[PDB]
Enzyme design. Structure first.
Site, PDB file in Angstrom:
ATOM      1  N   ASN A 129      -7.903  -4.079  -2.572  1.00  0.00           N
ATOM      2  CA  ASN A 129      -8.429  -4.338  -1.197  1.00  0.00           C
ATOM      3  C   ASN A 129      -9.697  -4.667  -0.903  1.00  0.00           C
ATOM      4  OD1 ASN A 129      -9.846  -1.664  -1.306  1.00  0.00           O
ATOM      5  ND2 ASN A 129      -8.133  -0.586  -0.817  1.00  0.00           N
ATOM      6  N   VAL A 165       4.051  -2.561   3.506  1.00  0.00           N
ATOM      7  CA  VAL A 165       3.995  -3.722   2.794  1.00  0.00           C
ATOM      8  C   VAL A 165       3.354  -4.796   3.482  1.00  0.00           C
ATOM      9  CG1 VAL A 165       5.419  -5.656   1.602  1.00  0.00           C
ATOM     10  CG2 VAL A 165       6.254  -3.265   2.043  1.00  0.00           C
ATOM     11  N   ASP A 207      -7.550  -3.038   4.406  1.00  0.00           N
ATOM     12  CA  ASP A 207      -6.960  -2.016   4.478  1.00  0.00           C
ATOM     13  C   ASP A 207      -7.250  -0.387   4.345  1.00  0.00           C
ATOM     14  OD1 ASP A 207      -4.061  -1.195   4.390  1.00  0.00           O
ATOM     15  OD2 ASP A 207      -4.333  -0.683   2.370  1.00  0.00           O
ATOM     16  N   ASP A 233     -10.334   4.440   0.425  1.00  0.00           N
ATOM     17  CA  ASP A 233      -9.500   4.361  -0.585  1.00  0.00           C
ATOM     18  C   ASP A 233      -9.635   2.748  -1.263  1.00  0.00           C
ATOM     19  OD1 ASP A 233      -7.521   4.362  -2.535  1.00  0.00           O
ATOM     20  OD2 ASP A 233      -5.915   3.640  -1.567  1.00  0.00           O
ATOM     21  N   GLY A 292       0.756  -1.135  -0.025  1.00  0.00           N
ATOM     22  CA  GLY A 292      -0.033  -0.035   0.009  1.00  0.00           C
ATOM     23  C   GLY A 292       0.935   1.116   0.143  1.00  0.00           C
TER      24      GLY A 292
HETATM   25  N1  LIG Z   1      -6.139 -10.049   4.935  1.00  0.00           N
HETATM   26  C1  LIG Z   1      -5.716 -10.033   3.838  1.00  0.00           C
HETATM   27  N2  LIG Z   1      -5.550 -11.184   3.153  1.00  0.00           N
HETATM   28  C2  LIG Z   1      -4.852 -11.100   2.001  1.00  0.00           C
HETATM   29  N3  LIG Z   1      -4.919 -12.100   1.037  1.00  0.00           N
HETATM   30  C3  LIG Z   1      -4.366 -11.883  -0.206  1.00  0.00           C
HETATM   31  C4  LIG Z   1      -4.485 -13.165  -0.533  1.00  0.00           C
HETATM   32  C5  LIG Z   1      -4.025 -13.256  -1.948  1.00  0.00           C
HETATM   33  C6  LIG Z   1      -4.198 -12.215  -2.826  1.00  0.00           C
HETATM   34  S1  LIG Z   1      -3.913 -12.354  -4.626  1.00  0.00           S
HETATM   35  N4  LIG Z   1      -3.203 -11.006  -5.290  1.00  0.00           N
HETATM   36  O1  LIG Z   1      -5.046 -12.535  -5.130  1.00  0.00           O
HETATM   37  O2  LIG Z   1      -3.036 -13.449  -4.905  1.00  0.00           O
HETATM   38  C7  LIG Z   1      -4.363 -10.805  -2.500  1.00  0.00           C
HETATM   39  C8  LIG Z   1      -4.565 -10.765  -0.837  1.00  0.00           C
HETATM   40  S2  LIG Z   1      -4.455  -9.191   1.740  1.00  0.00           S
HETATM   41  C9  LIG Z   1      -4.928  -8.704   3.484  1.00  0.00           C
HETATM   42  C10 LIG Z   1      -5.166  -7.478   3.877  1.00  0.00           C
HETATM   43  O3  LIG Z   1      -5.665  -7.320   5.062  1.00  0.00           O
HETATM   44  C11 LIG Z   1      -4.377  -6.437   3.353  1.00  0.00           C
HETATM   45  C12 LIG Z   1      -3.649  -5.503   3.812  1.00  0.00           C
HETATM   46  C13 LIG Z   1      -3.067  -4.591   3.344  1.00  0.00           C
HETATM   47  C14 LIG Z   1      -3.030  -4.228   1.953  1.00  0.00           C
HETATM   48  C15 LIG Z   1      -2.376  -3.276   1.320  1.00  0.00           C
HETATM   49  C16 LIG Z   1      -2.535  -3.031  -0.384  1.00  0.00           C
HETATM   50  C17 LIG Z   1      -3.605  -3.783  -0.967  1.00  0.00           C
HETATM   51  C18 LIG Z   1      -4.275  -4.751  -0.307  1.00  0.00           C
HETATM   52  C19 LIG Z   1      -3.930  -4.995   1.054  1.00  0.00           C
HETATM   53  C20 LIG Z   1      -4.574  -5.963   1.868  1.00  0.00           C
END
Ligand SMILES: Nc1nc(Nc2ccc(S(N)(=O)=O)cc2)sc1C(=O)c1ccc2ccccc2c1
Length: 278
Positions: free
Chosen positions: A125, A17, A138, A120, A13
């Site tokens: 997210n 990270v 997020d 955002d 973000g």
């Molecule tokens: N809880 C949670 N789980 C996740 N898993 C995930 C598993 C697979 C994929 S994916 N690209 O589909 O393989 C993506 C996420 S992320 C996330 C967040 O709490 C989180 C925290 C900060 C962030 C900062 C910026 C953007 C998102 C954000 C999300």
């Protein structure tokens, strides 16, 4: 940290990270956000821990140590951006699109009633699981994508309202439906003008006070509003009606999450299971 085992980096973000990690002691798999370093946001954050809703990613722990701030969240397996890309050839089934929008509106209705804004929202997210749920992740505290930014933010408003999240969600709703970003601007002014070219350049009639906003310029080009049926063709009239209300220029006219949940578009809402490739 030492308590966690970084399985892999899964995102980044503006503040930090995020890693998929395993609690070396409990074996719990979590999403760990690392922020490299106040005494005010701490409460704001520590408070987010209280928020508990099926459509909001649970914040498990907040750890401030060694000039670093770590946030531990429950782990979801895929984000909406990846899912949309994986569904580009066929498109996400309307019933699933409707279910996701409905759930996200419930999440927003909940946070907004607790006076919490996201600020955002974007496909990256919005997280999904194998059971058909989708959750807000997020939360933003009080190359950056501007595609989902509400017009009042782009025009320099100093105080955001819950309406900024409705706008972002409306943009995401349109994108799920058409498989094309609604307003893909590459700069603040390009973003603003793409919105103008589609919804028409706002004026005092549709947006009282718009000409008095910090970044408003009388010199803005005057574009006429485009036919809405050309904006999201595959969407039925109930969907288009709801989308138009989520994209009203005037923050005060833009539909609330609570009112949106009562819209006719959701009369036949269901909870389908998505086909996820993990
Ligand atoms: N809880 C949670 N789980 C996740 N898993 C995930 C598993 C697979 C994929 S994916 N690209 O589909 O393989 C993506 C996420 S992320 C996330 C967040 O709490 C989180 C925290 C900060 C962030 C900062 C910026 C953007 C998102 C954000 C999300």
């Amino acid at each position: 940290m030492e308590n966690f085992q970084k399985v892999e980096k899964i995102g980044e973000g503006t503040y930090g990270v995020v890693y998929k990690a395993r609690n070396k002691l409990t074996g719990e798999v979590v999403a760990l956000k690392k922020i490299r370093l106040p005494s005010t946001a701490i409460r704001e954050i520590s408070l987010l821990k209280e928020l508990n809703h099926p459509n909001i990613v649970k914040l498990l722990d907040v750890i401030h140590t060694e000039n670093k701030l770590y946030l531990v969240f429950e782990f979801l397996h895929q984000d909406l951006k990846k899912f949309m890309d994986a569904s580009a050839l066929t498109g996400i089934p309307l019933p699933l699109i409707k279910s996701y929008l409905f759930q996200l509106l419930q999440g927003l209705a909940f946070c907004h009633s607790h006076r919490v804004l996201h600020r955002d929202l974007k496909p990256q997210n919005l997280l999904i699981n194998t059971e058909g749920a989708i959750k807000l992740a997020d939360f933003g505290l009080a190359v950056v994508t501007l595609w989902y930014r509400a017009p009042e933010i782009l025009l320099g408003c100093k105080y955001y309202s819950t309406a900024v999240d409705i706008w972002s969600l409306g943009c995401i709703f349109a994108e799920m439906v058409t498989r094309r970003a609604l307003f893909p601007g590459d700069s603040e002014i390009d973003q603003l003008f793409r919105i103008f070219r589609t919804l028409g350049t706002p004026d005092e009639v549709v947006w009282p006070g718009v000409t008095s906003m910090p970044d408003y310029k009388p010199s803005f080009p005057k574009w006429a509003r485009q036919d809405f049926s050309k904006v999201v063709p595959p969407l039925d009239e109930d969907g288009r009606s709801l989308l138009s209300q989520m994209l009203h220029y005037d923050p005060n006219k833009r539909i609330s999450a609570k009112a949106a949940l009562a819209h006719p578009f959701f009369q036949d809402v269901t909870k389908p299971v998505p086909h996820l490739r993990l």
